[PDB]
Amino acid sequence: KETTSFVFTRFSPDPQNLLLQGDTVVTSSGHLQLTQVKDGEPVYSSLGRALYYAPIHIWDSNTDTVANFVTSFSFVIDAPNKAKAADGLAFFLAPVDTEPQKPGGLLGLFHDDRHNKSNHIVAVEFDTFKNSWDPEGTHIGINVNSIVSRKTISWDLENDEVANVVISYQASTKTLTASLVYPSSSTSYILNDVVDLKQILPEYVRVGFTAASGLSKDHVETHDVLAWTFDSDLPDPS
Amino acid sequence: KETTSFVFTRFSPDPQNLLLQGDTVVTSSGHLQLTQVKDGEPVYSSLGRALYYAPIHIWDSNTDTVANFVTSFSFVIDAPNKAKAADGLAFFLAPVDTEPQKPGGLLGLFHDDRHNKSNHIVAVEFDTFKNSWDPEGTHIGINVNSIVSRKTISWDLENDEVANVVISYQASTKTLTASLVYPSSSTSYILNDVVDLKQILPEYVRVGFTAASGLSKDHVETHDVLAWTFDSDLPDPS
Amino acid sequence: KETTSFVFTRFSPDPQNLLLQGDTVVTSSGHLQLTQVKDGEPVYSSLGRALYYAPIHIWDSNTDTVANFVTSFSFVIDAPNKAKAADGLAFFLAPVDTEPQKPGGLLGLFHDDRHNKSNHIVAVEFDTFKNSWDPEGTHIGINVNSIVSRKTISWDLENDEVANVVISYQASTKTLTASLVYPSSSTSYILNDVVDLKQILPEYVRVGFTAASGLSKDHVETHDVLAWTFDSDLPDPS
Amino acid sequence: KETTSFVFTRFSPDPQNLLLQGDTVVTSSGHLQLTQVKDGEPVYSSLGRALYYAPIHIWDSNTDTVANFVTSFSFVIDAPNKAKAADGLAFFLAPVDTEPQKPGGLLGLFHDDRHNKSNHIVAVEFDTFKNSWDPEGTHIGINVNSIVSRKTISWDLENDEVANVVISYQASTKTLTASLVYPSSSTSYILNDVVDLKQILPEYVRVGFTAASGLSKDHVETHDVLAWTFDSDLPDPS
Ligand SMILES: *[C@@H]1O[C@H](CO)[C@@H](O[C@@H]2O[C@H](CO)[C@@H](O[C@@H]3O[C@H](CO)[C@@H](O)[C@H](O[C@H]4O[C@H](CO)[C@@H](O)[C@H](O)[C@@H]4O)[C@@H]3O[C@@H]3OC[C@@H](O)[C@H](O)[C@H]3O)[C@H](O)[C@H]2NC(C)=O)[C@H](O[C@@H]2O[C@@H](C)[C@@H](O)[C@@H](O)[C@@H]2O)[C@H]1NC(C)=O
Ligand SMILES: *[C@@H]1O[C@H](CO)[C@@H](O[C@@H]2O[C@H](CO)[C@@H](O[C@@H]3O[C@H](CO)[C@@H](O)[C@H](O)[C@@H]3O)[C@H](O)[C@H]2NC(C)=O)[C@H](O[C@@H]2O[C@@H](C)[C@@H](O)[C@@H](O)[C@@H]2O)[C@H]1NC(C)=O
Ligand SMILES: *[C@@H]1O[C@H](CO)[C@@H](O[C@@H]2O[C@H](CO)[C@@H](O[C@@H]3O[C@H](CO)[C@@H](O)[C@H](O)[C@@H]3O)[C@H](O)[C@H]2NC(C)=O)[C@H](O[C@@H]2O[C@@H](C)[C@@H](O)[C@@H](O)[C@@H]2O)[C@H]1NC(C)=O
Ligand SMILES: CC(=O)N[C@@H]1[C@@H](O)[C@@H](O)[C@@H](CO)O[C@H]1O
Ligand SMILES: CC(=O)N[C@@H]1[C@@H](O)[C@@H](O)[C@@H](CO)O[C@H]1O
Ligand SMILES: CC(=O)N[C@@H]1[C@@H](O)[C@@H](O)[C@@H](CO)O[C@H]1O
Ligand SMILES: CC(=O)N[C@@H]1[C@@H](O)[C@@H](O)[C@@H](CO)O[C@H]1O
Numbered sequence: 001k002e003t004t005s006f007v008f009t010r011f012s013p014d015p016q017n018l019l020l021q022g023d024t025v026v027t028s029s030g031h032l033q034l035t036q037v038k039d040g041e042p043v044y045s046s047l048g049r050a051l052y053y054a055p056i057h058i059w060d061s062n063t064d065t066v067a068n069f070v071t072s073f074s075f076v077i078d079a080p081n082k083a084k085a086a087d088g089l090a091f092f093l094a095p096v097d098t099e100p101q102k103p104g105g106l107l108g109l110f111h112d113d114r115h116n117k118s119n120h121i122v123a124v125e126f127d128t129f130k131n132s133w134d135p136e137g138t139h140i141g142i143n144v145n146s147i148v149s150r151k152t153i154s155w156d157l158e159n160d161e162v163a164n165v166v167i168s169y170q171a172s173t174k175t176l177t178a179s180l181v182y183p184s185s186s187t188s189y190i191l192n193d194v195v196d197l198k199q200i201l202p203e204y205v206r207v208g209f210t211a212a213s214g215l216s217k218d219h220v221e222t223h224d225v226l227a228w229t230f231d232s233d234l235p236d237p238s
Numbered sequence: 239k240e241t242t243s244f245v246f247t248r249f250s251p252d253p254q255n256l257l258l259q260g261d262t263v264v265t266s267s268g269h270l271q272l273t274q275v276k277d278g279e280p281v282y283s284s285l286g287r288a289l290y291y292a293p294i295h296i297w298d299s300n301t302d303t304v305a306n307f308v309t310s311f312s313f314v315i316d317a318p319n320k321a322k323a324a325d326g327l328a329f330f331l332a333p334v335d336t337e338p339q340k341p342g343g344l345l346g347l348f349h350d351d352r353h354n355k356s357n358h359i360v361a362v363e364f365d366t367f368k369n370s371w372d373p374e375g376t377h378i379g380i381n382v383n384s385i386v387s388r389k390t391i392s393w394d395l396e397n398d399e400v401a402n403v404v405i406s407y408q409a410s411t412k413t414l415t416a417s418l419v420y421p422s423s424s425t426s427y428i429l430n431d432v433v434d435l436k437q438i439l440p441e442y443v444r445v446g447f448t449a450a451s452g453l454s455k456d457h458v459e460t461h462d463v464l465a466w467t468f469d470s471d472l473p474d475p476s
Numbered sequence: 477k478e479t480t481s482f483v484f485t486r487f488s489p490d491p492q493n494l495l496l497q498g499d500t501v502v503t504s505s506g507h508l509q510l511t512q513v514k515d516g517e518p519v520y521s522s523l524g525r526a527l528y529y530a531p532i533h534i535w536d537s538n539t540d541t542v543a544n545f546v547t548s549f550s551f552v553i554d555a556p557n558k559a560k561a562a563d564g565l566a567f568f569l570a571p572v573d574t575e576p577q578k579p580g581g582l583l584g585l586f587h588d589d590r591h592n593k594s595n596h597i598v599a600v601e602f603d604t605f606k607n608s609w610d611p612e613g614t615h616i617g618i619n620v621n622s623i624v625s626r627k628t629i630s631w632d633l634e635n636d637e638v639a640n641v642v643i644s645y646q647a648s649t650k651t652l653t654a655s656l657v658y659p660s661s662s663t664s665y666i667l668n669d670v671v672d673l674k675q676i677l678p679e680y681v682r683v684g685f686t687a688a689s690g691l692s693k694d695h696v697e698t699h700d701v702l703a704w705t706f707d708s709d710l711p712d713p714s
Numbered sequence: 715k716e717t718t719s720f721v722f723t724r725f726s727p728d729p730q731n732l733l734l735q736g737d738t739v740v741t742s743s744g745h746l747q748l749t750q751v752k753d754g755e756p757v758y759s760s761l762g763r764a765l766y767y768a769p770i771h772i773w774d775s776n777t778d779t780v781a782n783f784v785t786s787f788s789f790v791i792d793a794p795n796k797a798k799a800a801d802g803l804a805f806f807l808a809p810v811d812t813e814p815q816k817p818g819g820l821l822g823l824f825h826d827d828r829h830n831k832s833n834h835i836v837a838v839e840f841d842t843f844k845n846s847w848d849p850e851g852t853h854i855g856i857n858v859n860s861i862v863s864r865k866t867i868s869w870d871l872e873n874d875e876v877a878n879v880v881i882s883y884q885a886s887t888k889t890l891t892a893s894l895v896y897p898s899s900s901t902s903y904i905l906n907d908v909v910d911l912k913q914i915l916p917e918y919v920r921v922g923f924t925a926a927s928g929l930s931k932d933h934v935e936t937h938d939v940l941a942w943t944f945d946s947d948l949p950d951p952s
């Protein structure tokens with residue numbers, strides 16, 4: 001049996017147990033600021049990610065066991081103009097050596113918009129901009145090896161309000177669940193889908209966040225994570 | 239700081255740390271069987287509840303702090319005839335000396351269908367039968383001092399399938415959230431509402447389940463809880 | 477799998493999830509005051525206990541599995557005259573319906589000084605007074621069904637200083653371990669012994685504290701518990 | 715608030731969340747084998763270490779808080795000849811970039827036997843061989859910036875038996891406590907001392923194990939870790 005967990009109720013600057021990639025900083029107020037902010041305003045064509053430093057053991061090929069995990073986080077997206085919000089934020093699992101990919105609507109996760117098993121990405125996206133591959137309206141998606149989501153639901157962005165997310169994986173039913181709640185307006189969202197982690201991901205992964213502002217100057221938003229817990233449990237064989 | 243927690247991944251017979259009320263038994267397969275089953279079939283006019291034996295400290299009048307809590311459970315409802323399903327199951331918080339009330343659509347929680355502050359009940363209901371006070375269709379509700387829910391959502395009962403529920407209370411936003419997922423069909427439901435526990439409940443409560451089969455012989459279903467975790471945290475002041 | 481846990485970093489007055497027995501009160505400073513205090517001084521012939529309200533499932537006769545547990549607590553003993561300190565404090569496990577027994581050197585645990593399997597008591601004692609059955613000097617003991625300890629070590633009472641205790645049970649080796657640390661003086665104590673909980677205790681027990689002041693007016697001390705955590709885990713069968 | 719934790723009830727081969735240094739391997743039976751073994755006999759002049767991959771945030775200079783932590787582990791030392799046992803095992807905290815130092819009685823921790831504040835090492839040692847700086851007999855020591863322990867106790871090595879260790883740090887009293895229990899013989903050991911982590915260590919550290927076999931062919935032993943849990947909690951400011 002192997003477990004990993006961590007809790008950040010706020011972030012400290014220069015976090016040596018986080019791998020910050022692209023534009024990501026920790027602010028002095030303790031937020032994980034994924035996309036760049038200049039003179040109080042979001043900057044376009046910005047891409048940031050943040051990963052927990054230690055690899056997570058999510059499945060074992062010797063014993064053929066798969067881990068459960070649950071993560072929670074709070075985030076804020078602030079678009080100066082809501083109709084021109086872009087591009088979004090995602091929580092993801094990826095190979096240990098993962099590096100930022102294309103900015104914009106590919107969210108730093110993929111180098112193109114195709115399906116490809118060699119990506120080894122599972123992600124939950126909070127997608128604020130309609131690209132050619134997206135359904136109509138802002139949405140939450142479960143993504144496996146592609147920016148084109150396996151399943152989506154409608155989600156109305158509440159601008160500059162705190163969103164509380166929980167994402168969990170139940171290995172016995174191969175089910176990934178993702179929920180978002182806005183306590184300020186009592187609005188909530190949920191979806192789940194079958195995802196087989198053993199087929200998709202390597203035995204060890206890194207986990208974290210990615211976000212991207214839009215590729216034109218008028219399509220911008222901030223993406224701040226305020227807090228983050230993670231728990232995984234790789235059980236004994238059964 | 240005060241915390242309480244417990245986990246049952248299955249139930250043992252004669253559980254001395256559970257207060258079983260009404261018809262409740264533990265089966266040999268380790269399920270908490272809330273309504274009576276005779277010759278493989280559910281019995282009508284059955285009422286059962288089950289509560290954790292220790293009172294939970296959910297708020298402190300000395301320090302004026304309120305607890306957070308999160309509970310998870312799995313349940314199954316099996317109606318021999320789905321169109322004649324009744325009456326439902328609920329998770330609730332109530333005063334320590336709580337006793338079963340009226341059977342049927344009052345779910346063992348209330349002695350009538352009125353709003354009354356002296357009930358001191360907060361509950362999440364999984365309501366399989368439309369009474370005069372209910373909205374159309376089977377539904378999930380948040381209930382405060384009344385069988386008439388403060389807020390509801392549509393919920394399609396998946397007969398004899400395992401439902402995974404999580405209910406949580408965030409004291410800083412006074413928000414109660416309830417989710418239900420069916421991993422078998424990848425279907426999921428969520429709602430949340432403002433509930434002020436300090437106004438509604440006494441400082442110590444008991445927590446648990448209640449269920450009721452219908453009051454006519456043809457309107458019946460089973461109500462089994464398979465597993466239950468509970469966690470509460472009453473923080474230090476300020 | 478069944479787990480129970482709780483944490484009190486301090487105690488609130490009228491604690492409804494604790495069974496207070498004998499003289500026990502909660503002070504305004506949030507201490508669990510086991511033996512009586514009058515005009516700033518300890519009172520003789522005083523006996524107090526305190527138990528967590530919910531029974532603990534420590535072993536299951538169906539599956540023949542036994543729980544692990546760990547408990548921690550901080551206590552203070554203040555003897556006005558150290559040479560006349562009596563009688564002591566103990567942490568114990570006992571049947572659910574347990575009631576206080578004889579005061580004095582029997583510590584509220586036993587009705588006599590003999591060995592008897594029908595007691596169903598396992599205890600760790602912090603013994604400040606030499607009775608006929610005791611070794612020389614103040615000591616810590618592991619006690620099974622008798623005030624005459626199965627094993628003891630020397631322990632020097634540090635008067636009015638905070639003692640941090642941890643007691644744990646490892647079921648696979650049948651080993652009970654007890655440690656005491658005084659952080660003020662950097663002094664520490666440990667012992668362990670084989671105890672088979674399945675032979676000694678019923679399936680469900682209550683856990684908590686007992687203490688007794690001496691049976692003459694000049695042989696007195698206070699016994700205050702400042703904080704208490706408990707964790708038990710009854711695993712799935714092998 | 716920041717917490718880190720992990721649990722290994724056994725080890726898997728090629729553990730990507732452990733930084734293995736020197737001779738360390740994971741066996742097929744799931745042991746962390748710190749010093750080299752050639753066909754079930756220990757090899758001399760062997761040095762191995764193992765660290766959790768993620769840095770631990772043990773204190774924060776912004777908020778002036780210091781973390782508590784607790785770690786537990788099980789180890790086995792098997793000396794073919796007990797009288798010629800060498801050199802030992804240690805649990806330690808060190809700067810993130812820490813590298814193995816001198817083999818033998820310096821245990822892979824230090825490059826010499828002097829006191830030096832630029833080491834930034836806190837360690838608990840299980841020392842099986844008497845060097846010039848050591849007290850008489852095999853012993854457990856608390857070490858701050860030097861192989862010459864700040865405090866020691868006598869410890870009798872029980873050859874090829876499982877030792878259960880717990881080490882904890884209480885920030886409010888600046889107290890480091892270390893215990894060892896042999897459940898097989900019911901023997902146990904404990905010590906504690908004042909250590910101010912803020913003065914000694916950087917804000918982020920790595921934690922783990924080191925071990926060394928002796929520098930002559932007849933002074934050898936194995937050093938296997940069977941299991942390891944770690945928990946740290948860097949609290950919010952008052
Ligand atoms: C482990 O604990 C067991 C109880 O948990 C012990 O068994 C019990 O032992 C008592 C004697 O102590 C038994 O009770 C007695 O029954 C006889 C015969 O009917 C009575 O003569 C006797 O009453 C007289 O003695 C009392 C003092 O002992 C006086 O107070 C009383 O006034 C009489 O003069 C006594 O009966 C009890 O009297 C008080 C009433 O409140 C009570 O209802 C009444 O029972 C008792 O029956 C027995 N219990 C059980 C369930 O068996 C056990 O003691 C050992 O075994 C017993 C049977 C005796 O042989 C003991 O000599 C022996 O020690 C004890 N074991 C040890 C090693 O301590
Ligand atoms: C699905 O994903 C795989 C793995 O990422 C893609 O194959 C890889 O494509 C890279 C190019 O983007 C290859 O590396 C290149 O090597 C050449 C020299 O040989 C260099 O000049 C160049 O700068 C790159 O480093 C990489 O080697 C290749 N790996 C394999 C196993 O083929 C794959 O890309 C698609 O197939 C490959 C073979 C190429 O034909 C690509 O053009 C093509 O996009 C991905 N498949 C799809 C359909 O996207
Ligand atoms: C809200 O719920 C409370 C608590 O259940 C109701 O108050 C209770 O009303 C009962 C009457 O139905 C009282 O019982 C009676 O006691 C008297 C004297 O002891 C007997 O003569 C008689 O035979 C009954 O058995 C009960 O004592 C009372 N309890 C309390 C704590 O007040 C309450 O009912 C409302 O207020 C009460 C005081 C009456 O005025 C009712 O008429 C009135 O409905 C409920 N409130 C509402 C608006 O429904
Ligand atoms: C393929 C791609 O990244 N498309 C981006 C879109 O995601 C969004 O950022 C938009 C804002 O103007 O510009 C497009 O270039
Ligand atoms: C108030 C009440 O219980 N009404 C019951 C309803 O809940 C259900 O049991 C049904 C089944 O026939 O009978 C109704 O008249
Ligand atoms: C058997 C018994 O309780 N003996 C007590 C002893 O514990 C202690 O209190 C002492 C002090 O004066 O008095 C004795 O009566
Ligand atoms: C400084 C040093 O490492 N001394 C080592 C001692 O630790 C032990 O290994 C011994 C083997 O018999 O050889 C000594 O030289």
Ligand SMILES: [Ca+2]
Nearest residue numbers: 105127129131
């Ligand atoms: Ca998009």
Ligand SMILES: [Ca+2]
Nearest residue numbers: 343365367369
């Ligand atoms: Ca109804």
Ligand SMILES: [Ca+2]
Nearest residue numbers: 581603605607
């Ligand atoms: Ca005594």
Ligand SMILES: [Ca+2]
Nearest residue numbers: 819841843845
């Ligand atoms: Ca040495």
Ligand SMILES: [Mn+2]
Nearest residue numbers: 127134141149
């Ligand atoms: Mn999308």
Ligand SMILES: [Mn+2]
Nearest residue numbers: 365372379387
């Ligand atoms: Mn309803």
Ligand SMILES: [Mn+2]
Nearest residue numbers: 603610617625
């Ligand atoms: Mn004694």
Ligand SMILES: [Mn+2]
Nearest residue numbers: 841848855863
């Ligand atoms: Mn030494």
